[PDB]
Amino acid sequence: KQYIISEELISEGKWVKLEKTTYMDPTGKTRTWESVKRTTRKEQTADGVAVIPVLQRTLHYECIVLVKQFRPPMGGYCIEFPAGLIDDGETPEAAALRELEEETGYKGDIAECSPAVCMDPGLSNCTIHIVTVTINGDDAENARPKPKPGDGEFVEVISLPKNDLLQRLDALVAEEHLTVDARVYSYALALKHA
Amino acid sequence: KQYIISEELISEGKWVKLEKTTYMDPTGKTRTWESVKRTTRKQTADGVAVIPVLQRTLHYECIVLVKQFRPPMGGYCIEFPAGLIDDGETPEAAALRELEEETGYKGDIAECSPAVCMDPGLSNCTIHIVTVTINGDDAENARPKPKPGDGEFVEVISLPKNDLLQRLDALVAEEHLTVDARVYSYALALKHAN
Ligand SMILES: Cc1ccc(C(N)=O)c(F)c1
Numbered sequence: 324k325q326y327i328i329s330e331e332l333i334s335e336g337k338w339v340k341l342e343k344t345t346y347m348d349p350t351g352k353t354r355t356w357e358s359v360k361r362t363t364r365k366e367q368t369a370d371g372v373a374v375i376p377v378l379q380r381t382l383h384y385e386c387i388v389l390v391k392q393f394r395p396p397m398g399g400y401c402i403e404f405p406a407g408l409i410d411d412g413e414t415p416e417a418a419a420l421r422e423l424e425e426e427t428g429y430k431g432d433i434a435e436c437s438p439a440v441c442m443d444p445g446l447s448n449c450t451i452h453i454v455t456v457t458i459n460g461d462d463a464e465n466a467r468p469k470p471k472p473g474d475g476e477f478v479e480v481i482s483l484p485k486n487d488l489l490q491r492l493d494a495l496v497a498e499e500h501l502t503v504d505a506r507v508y509s510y511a512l513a514l515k516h517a
Numbered sequence: 518k519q520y521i522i523s524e525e526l527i528s529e530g531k532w533v534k535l536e537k538t539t540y541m542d543p544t545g546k547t548r549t550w551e552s553v554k555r556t557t558r559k560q561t562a563d564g565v566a567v568i569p570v571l572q573r574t575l576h577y578e579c580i581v582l583v584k585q586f587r588p589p590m591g592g593y594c595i596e597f598p599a600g601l602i603d604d605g606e607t608p609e610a611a612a613l614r615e616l617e618e619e620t621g622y623k624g625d626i627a628e629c630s631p632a633v634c635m636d637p638g639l640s641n642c643t644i645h646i647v648t649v650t651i652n653g654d655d656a657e658n659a660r661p662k663p664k665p666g667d668g669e670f671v672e673v674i675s676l677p678k679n680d681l682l683q684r685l686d687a688l689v690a691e692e693h694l695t696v697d698a699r700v701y702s703y704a705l706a707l708k709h710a711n
């Protein structure tokens with residue numbers, strides 16, 4: 324029933340733009356919405372990837388590998404899955420493995436790749452693939468992992484046990500001013516609920 | 518180590534604004550970022566998202582989701598019930614209210630997250646994730662009455678919690694919909710648990 328009638332550019336930066344979206348509502352009336360988009364999306368099936376990195380080691384509980392970084396939009400530090408935008412011509416899987424290595428040092432193995440999922444669909448058109456990757460932490464390549472951060476990238480790695488993820492995130496949030504990402508929290512809550 | 522120095526307004530709509538954030542990188546070098554913010558925040562967070570656990574005896578437990586046209590996305594999305602927190606409303610109260618408006622169901626609060634970020638590389642948007650159980654055997658949830666506000670047109674989709682990820686993948690394959698990243702993350706963790 325509903326569809327886009329027009330998309331008017333309001334303001335365009337280097338990385339983000341704002342649009343006035345006109346669409347048809349299901350009564351058959353014309354309405355508008357204010358829409359955010361990135362300027363960087365070419366033929367990628369999504370803007371970015373987020374990586375769910377399951378660190379697996381003999382005689383260890385499985386860990387979920389997370390990253391903590393300063394996020395200028397938030398004005399502070401956030402804890403997130405490793406993530407980055409997909410380069411032009413790059414597959415979501417390659418992007419995931421690459422970002423995981425750049426941000427954490429680990430070399431993962433693909434497990435699964437989601438369809439493109441929406442980040443905040445009432446506000447933006449931004450999408451990611453969620454890429455599950457296992458990390459064989461007994462491999463020598465993954466012994467002493469060092470991030471290879473790009474220019475202006477400054478990332479801390481936090482590995483937390485899957486079997487206590489929600490409580491461990493709560494204990495990090497109780498100790499310092501930081502925000503947990505909604506996808507991480509959702510993942511941690513389902514682990515509890517399961 | 519890192520912090521915001523200044524925020525320059527680039528463009529302000531009714532609902533959303535774009536800013537250029539200047540911040541101090543950890544090397545001592547000043548950098549800029551293009552940031553999105555809502556103009557509606559007063560509150561602990563911008564919004565709530567509700568994880569509604571529909572419990573009916575002799576039935577599988579279901580997660581209650583909503584399908585709506587999202588103008589920024591140009592199409593239909595499958596999401597947790599959700600909306601912005603009214604000025605002077607608690608996140609819990611927003612959760613039960615939005616759940617009723619969007620689904621007709623009357624639930625009970627199970628737990629409430631701290632404010633968590635939606636897309637912190639792009640925006641300052643935050644929500645509380647509120648877990649709510651719904652006694653589907655109670656008379657008030659027999660014929661749930663969804664009360665759409667002006668310009669909301671919401672379909673309710675209840676999926677079994679135990680097969681959530683496969684059921685969502687199926688909707689994406691058949692119905693050309695976009696699943697929300699938080700919903701997808703929750704679904705992944707249900708499978709990844711134990
Ligand atoms: C309730 C509401 C309605 C429209 C918008 C919009 N972005 O145009 C919003 F962010 C919130």
Ligand SMILES: [Cl-]
Pocket residue numbers: 516570627648650
């Ligand atoms: Cl529950």
Ligand SMILES: [Mg+2]
Pocket residue numbers: 405406407422426
């Ligand atoms: Mg990143």
Ligand SMILES: [Mg+2]
Pocket residue numbers: 406407422425426476
């Ligand atoms: Mg990166």
Ligand SMILES: [Mg+2]
Pocket residue numbers: 598599600619
């Ligand atoms: Mg809503």
Ligand SMILES: [Mg+2]
Pocket residue numbers: 599600615618619666669
């Ligand atoms: Mg609503």
